[PDB]
């Protein structure tokens, strides 16, 4: 299979953002869909950063989509997960919660299966979170724990792309790995697509698309 592309819409104060605002999240999502997106990666930055939420707006965006949706941002307990899942999204990403409440993450993996993917933010070989605990310990300890809890998928962010980290995570698991962040060129996407046989399934791309560095049409061509 070819590398999956997940164009992102990152939502802050009701807007698709980078500092720079790109206006309506709904319009942005529909534009990716019209340009051939198979996935939308929709992020609540306010919920992720603890400065409120965009829950109702994100629900509206998700409802408008006919393509697969991946939701992330502040999904840290039963009620926030319930709302997220009620969008009919294909899956959600849990980040901070994996670090802070490993028992809750284990529970929701058992209940929801591959509706759950776990986001791993790696500085070197240690993990980092957006909550109160800054140090999340050794990457490989957490991968082993989540592997054995039945975690269906990992989303991996370094700290263009850290191809060595991606391959190292692929070595440590038989679950699909999704690359996130550090894509700034079509050549970065080609390099990541070279890791598909190793177990990289997809790449999330935000910044470079809004900046008009490359178009989603160019991106899909490059990974075809």
CSV table of C-alpha atoms in Angstrom, one decimal:
chain,number,residue,atom,x,y,z
A,1,UNK,CA,0.0,0.0,0.0
A,2,UNK,CA,1.1,3.6,-0.5
A,3,UNK,CA,1.8,5.9,2.4
A,4,UNK,CA,-1.4,7.4,3.7
A,5,UNK,CA,-1.6,11.2,4.0
A,6,UNK,CA,-3.5,12.9,6.8
A,7,UNK,CA,-3.7,16.6,6.1
A,8,UNK,CA,-4.2,18.4,9.4
A,9,UNK,CA,-6.6,21.2,10.6
A,10,UNK,CA,-5.3,22.5,13.9
A,11,UNK,CA,-8.0,24.6,15.7
A,12,UNK,CA,-7.3,27.5,18.0
A,13,UNK,CA,-9.9,30.1,19.0
A,14,UNK,CA,-12.3,28.9,16.3
A,15,UNK,CA,-9.8,29.1,13.5
A,16,UNK,CA,-7.5,26.9,11.5
A,17,UNK,CA,-4.0,28.0,12.5
A,18,UNK,CA,-0.3,27.4,12.0
A,19,UNK,CA,0.4,32.6,14.8
A,20,UNK,CA,-1.1,32.7,11.3
A,21,UNK,CA,-4.8,32.2,10.9
A,22,UNK,CA,-6.2,30.3,7.9
A,23,UNK,CA,-9.9,31.1,8.7
A,24,UNK,CA,-12.6,28.5,8.9
A,25,UNK,CA,-11.7,25.0,10.0
A,26,UNK,CA,-14.7,23.7,8.1
A,27,UNK,CA,-13.7,25.4,4.9
A,28,UNK,CA,-10.1,24.1,5.3
A,29,UNK,CA,-11.3,20.6,5.9
A,30,UNK,CA,-13.6,20.7,2.9
A,31,UNK,CA,-10.8,22.0,0.7
A,32,UNK,CA,-8.5,19.1,1.5
A,33,UNK,CA,-11.4,16.7,0.9
A,34,UNK,CA,-12.0,18.3,-2.5
A,35,UNK,CA,-8.3,18.0,-3.4
A,36,UNK,CA,-8.4,14.3,-2.8
A,37,UNK,CA,-7.7,13.7,0.9
A,38,UNK,CA,-8.5,10.2,2.1
A,39,UNK,CA,-8.1,11.3,5.8
A,40,UNK,CA,-8.5,14.5,7.9
A,41,UNK,CA,-6.4,15.0,11.0
A,42,UNK,CA,-8.5,17.4,13.2
A,43,UNK,CA,-6.9,18.9,16.3
A,44,UNK,CA,-8.3,20.8,19.2
A,45,UNK,CA,-5.3,22.9,20.2
A,46,UNK,CA,-7.2,24.8,23.0
A,47,UNK,CA,-8.1,21.5,24.6
A,48,UNK,CA,-4.5,20.2,24.1
A,49,UNK,CA,-3.0,23.3,25.7
A,50,UNK,CA,-5.6,23.8,28.4
A,51,UNK,CA,-7.0,27.1,27.1
A,52,UNK,CA,-10.6,26.0,26.6
A,53,UNK,CA,-12.0,23.9,23.7
A,54,UNK,CA,-13.5,23.8,20.2
A,55,UNK,CA,-15.6,20.7,20.8
A,56,UNK,CA,-18.8,21.9,19.1
A,57,UNK,CA,-17.0,23.4,16.1
A,58,UNK,CA,-14.9,20.2,15.7
A,59,UNK,CA,-18.1,18.1,15.8
A,60,UNK,CA,-19.5,20.3,13.0
A,61,UNK,CA,-16.4,19.8,10.9
A,62,UNK,CA,-16.4,16.1,11.4
A,63,UNK,CA,-20.1,15.8,10.5
A,64,UNK,CA,-19.4,17.6,7.2
A,65,UNK,CA,-16.7,15.1,6.1
A,66,UNK,CA,-17.3,12.0,3.9
A,67,UNK,CA,-13.7,10.9,4.4
A,68,UNK,CA,-12.0,9.2,7.3
A,69,UNK,CA,-11.4,11.5,10.4
A,70,UNK,CA,-8.8,11.3,13.1
A,71,UNK,CA,-9.4,13.5,16.1
A,72,UNK,CA,-6.9,14.7,18.7
A,73,UNK,CA,-6.7,17.2,21.5
A,74,UNK,CA,-7.5,17.0,25.2
A,75,UNK,CA,-8.9,13.5,25.0
A,76,UNK,CA,-8.0,12.4,28.5
A,77,UNK,CA,-11.1,10.9,30.2
A,78,UNK,CA,-14.4,9.0,29.6
A,79,UNK,CA,-16.6,12.0,28.7
A,80,UNK,CA,-14.1,13.7,26.3
A,81,UNK,CA,-13.6,10.4,24.6
A,82,UNK,CA,-17.3,9.7,24.4
A,83,UNK,CA,-17.9,13.0,22.6
A,84,UNK,CA,-15.0,12.5,20.3
A,85,UNK,CA,-16.2,9.0,19.3
A,86,UNK,CA,-19.8,10.2,18.8
A,87,UNK,CA,-18.5,12.3,15.8
A,88,UNK,CA,-18.2,8.9,14.0
A,89,UNK,CA,-14.5,9.6,13.6
A,90,UNK,CA,-12.4,6.6,12.4
A,91,UNK,CA,-10.1,7.0,15.4
A,92,UNK,CA,-8.8,9.3,18.1
A,93,UNK,CA,-5.2,10.1,19.3
A,94,UNK,CA,-4.4,10.0,23.0
A,95,UNK,CA,-1.2,11.8,24.0
A,96,UNK,CA,-0.9,13.3,27.5
A,97,UNK,CA,-3.2,10.6,28.9
A,98,UNK,CA,-0.8,7.8,28.0
A,99,UNK,CA,1.8,9.4,30.2
A,100,UNK,CA,-0.4,10.6,33.0
A,101,UNK,CA,-3.1,7.9,33.4
A,102,UNK,CA,-1.7,4.6,31.9
A,103,UNK,CA,-4.5,2.6,33.5
A,104,UNK,CA,-7.2,4.7,31.7
A,105,UNK,CA,-5.4,4.3,28.4
A,106,UNK,CA,-5.3,0.5,29.0
A,107,UNK,CA,-9.0,0.5,29.7
A,108,UNK,CA,-10.0,2.4,26.7
A,109,UNK,CA,-7.8,0.3,24.3
A,110,UNK,CA,-9.6,-2.8,25.7
A,111,UNK,CA,-13.0,-1.1,25.1
A,112,UNK,CA,-12.4,0.6,21.8
A,113,UNK,CA,-9.6,-1.2,19.9
A,114,UNK,CA,-8.2,0.7,17.0
A,115,UNK,CA,-10.5,3.6,17.6
A,116,UNK,CA,-7.5,4.4,19.9
A,117,UNK,CA,-4.1,5.4,18.7
A,118,UNK,CA,-1.4,6.7,21.1
A,119,UNK,CA,0.7,9.7,20.4
A,120,UNK,CA,4.4,9.5,21.4
A,121,UNK,CA,6.3,12.8,21.6
A,122,UNK,CA,10.0,11.8,21.7
A,123,UNK,CA,13.0,14.0,22.6
A,124,UNK,CA,15.8,11.6,21.9
A,125,UNK,CA,14.6,8.4,23.6
A,126,UNK,CA,12.4,9.9,26.3
A,127,UNK,CA,8.7,11.0,26.1
A,128,UNK,CA,7.2,14.5,26.7
A,129,UNK,CA,3.6,15.6,27.4
A,130,UNK,CA,1.4,18.8,27.3
A,131,UNK,CA,0.1,18.2,30.9
A,132,UNK,CA,1.8,18.7,34.3
A,133,UNK,CA,4.3,15.8,34.2
A,134,UNK,CA,7.1,16.9,31.8
A,135,UNK,CA,9.2,13.7,31.8
A,136,UNK,CA,7.4,10.5,30.6
A,137,UNK,CA,10.4,8.1,30.8
A,138,UNK,CA,11.9,5.7,28.3
A,139,UNK,CA,10.4,5.3,24.9
A,140,UNK,CA,11.0,1.5,24.8
A,141,UNK,CA,9.4,0.9,28.2
A,142,UNK,CA,6.2,2.6,27.1
A,143,UNK,CA,6.2,0.9,23.7
A,144,UNK,CA,6.5,-2.5,25.5
A,145,UNK,CA,3.7,-1.6,27.9
A,146,UNK,CA,1.3,-0.4,25.2
A,147,UNK,CA,2.2,-3.3,22.9
A,148,UNK,CA,1.2,-5.7,25.6
A,149,UNK,CA,-2.0,-3.8,26.3
A,150,UNK,CA,-3.1,-4.3,22.7
A,151,UNK,CA,-2.5,-0.8,21.4
A,152,UNK,CA,-3.5,-0.8,17.8
A,153,UNK,CA,-1.4,2.1,16.4
A,154,UNK,CA,1.2,4.8,17.4
A,155,UNK,CA,1.6,8.4,16.2
A,156,UNK,CA,5.3,9.4,16.5
A,157,UNK,CA,6.6,13.0,16.8
A,158,UNK,CA,10.3,14.0,17.2
A,159,UNK,CA,10.6,16.4,20.2
A,160,UNK,CA,13.1,17.6,8.5
A,161,UNK,CA,11.6,14.2,9.7
A,162,UNK,CA,13.6,12.0,12.0
A,163,UNK,CA,13.7,8.9,9.8
A,164,UNK,CA,15.9,7.1,12.3
A,165,UNK,CA,13.3,7.5,15.1
A,166,UNK,CA,10.5,6.3,12.8
A,167,UNK,CA,12.5,3.2,11.9
A,168,UNK,CA,13.4,2.6,15.6
A,169,UNK,CA,9.8,2.6,16.6
A,170,UNK,CA,8.9,0.3,13.7
A,171,UNK,CA,11.6,-2.1,15.1
A,172,UNK,CA,9.9,-2.1,18.5
A,173,UNK,CA,6.4,-3.0,17.5
A,174,UNK,CA,4.2,-4.9,15.0
A,175,UNK,CA,1.5,-2.1,15.2
A,176,UNK,CA,1.2,0.6,12.5
A,177,UNK,CA,3.2,3.8,13.0
A,178,UNK,CA,2.0,7.2,11.7
A,179,UNK,CA,4.6,9.9,11.3
A,180,UNK,CA,3.7,13.3,12.7
A,181,UNK,CA,5.6,16.6,12.3
A,182,UNK,CA,8.8,17.7,10.7
A,183,UNK,CA,7.4,17.4,7.1
A,184,UNK,CA,8.5,20.5,5.2
A,185,UNK,CA,9.0,19.2,1.7
A,186,UNK,CA,7.7,16.6,-0.8
A,187,UNK,CA,11.2,15.0,-0.5
A,188,UNK,CA,10.4,14.5,3.2
A,189,UNK,CA,7.2,12.7,2.2
A,190,UNK,CA,9.1,10.5,-0.3
A,191,UNK,CA,11.6,9.6,2.4
A,192,UNK,CA,8.9,8.6,4.9
A,193,UNK,CA,7.1,6.6,2.1
A,194,UNK,CA,10.4,4.7,1.8
A,195,UNK,CA,9.6,3.3,5.4
A,196,UNK,CA,6.2,1.8,4.5
A,197,UNK,CA,7.7,-1.7,4.3
A,198,UNK,CA,9.2,-1.2,7.8
A,199,UNK,CA,5.7,-0.4,9.2
A,200,UNK,CA,5.1,3.3,8.6
A,201,UNK,CA,1.5,3.5,7.6
A,202,UNK,CA,0.9,7.3,7.1
A,203,UNK,CA,2.1,10.8,7.6
A,204,UNK,CA,0.2,13.8,9.2
A,205,UNK,CA,1.0,17.0,7.4
A,206,UNK,CA,-0.1,20.5,8.7
A,207,UNK,CA,2.3,23.5,8.4
A,208,UNK,CA,3.7,23.0,5.0
A,209,UNK,CA,0.3,22.7,3.4
A,210,UNK,CA,-1.1,26.0,4.9
A,211,UNK,CA,2.1,27.8,4.0
A,212,UNK,CA,1.5,26.7,0.3
A,213,UNK,CA,5.0,25.1,0.2
A,214,UNK,CA,3.4,22.2,-1.7
A,215,UNK,CA,-0.2,21.5,-2.5
A,216,UNK,CA,-2.1,18.4,-1.4
A,217,UNK,CA,-2.3,17.4,-5.1
A,218,UNK,CA,1.5,17.5,-5.3
A,219,UNK,CA,1.8,15.5,-2.1
A,220,UNK,CA,-0.6,12.8,-3.2
A,221,UNK,CA,1.3,12.5,-6.5
A,222,UNK,CA,4.6,12.3,-4.7
A,223,UNK,CA,3.4,9.3,-2.6
A,224,UNK,CA,1.6,7.6,-5.6
